[PDB]
Amino acid sequence: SNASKHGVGTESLFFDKVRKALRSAEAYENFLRCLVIFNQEVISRAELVQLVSPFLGKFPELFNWFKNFLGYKES
């Protein structure tokens, strides 16, 4: 309720893409596992983006969205 309506929009777009691209339940779980360990102060920013490389790295638009959201400079 009131989640992917007005507040969350492009983020839900991203996650839909991730869910649809990875296809595998455990692969999507993997993505979320990267999220939780990031949240749990375990992995660094770049470590997060790099970890999902074999997953989202195949999709430039998707991985770039991820980078843009994380504020991934690398510049």
């Binding site: 949240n39 102060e41 375990v42 790099q50």
Partner: protein, 94 residues
């Protein structure tokens, strides 16, 4: 016949991918050790990079996660503080 087992009746779901595997060897030694410290994984002294990756990967394959909440945490923290430092010791062990 069905209704006799809980197995899948499709044999193989729609997936031309072998399921993408996560490289945990790319992670920094510090990152892997941090995983072990935050998740509390008691180990033997003399750990190496490969050792860490195996242990981390073994436990990483068994992490309980929830779509809605995990997405919420991710969106929240990253839009707020992208990896906050805040140096503070919790447990006064010594």
């Amino acid at each position: 016949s069905n209704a006799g087992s809980d197995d899948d009746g499709g044999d193989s779901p729609v997936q031309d991918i072998d399921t993408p595997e996560v490289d945990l060897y790319q992670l920094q030694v510090n990152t892997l050790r941090r995983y072990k410290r935050h998740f509390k994984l008691p180990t033997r002294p003399g750990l190496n990079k490969a050792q860490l990756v195996e242990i981390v990967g073994c436990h990483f394959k068994s992490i309980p996660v929830n779509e809605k909440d995990t997405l919420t945490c991710f969106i929240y923290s990253v839009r707020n503080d992208k990896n906050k430092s805040d140096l503070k010791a919790d447990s006064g062990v010594h």
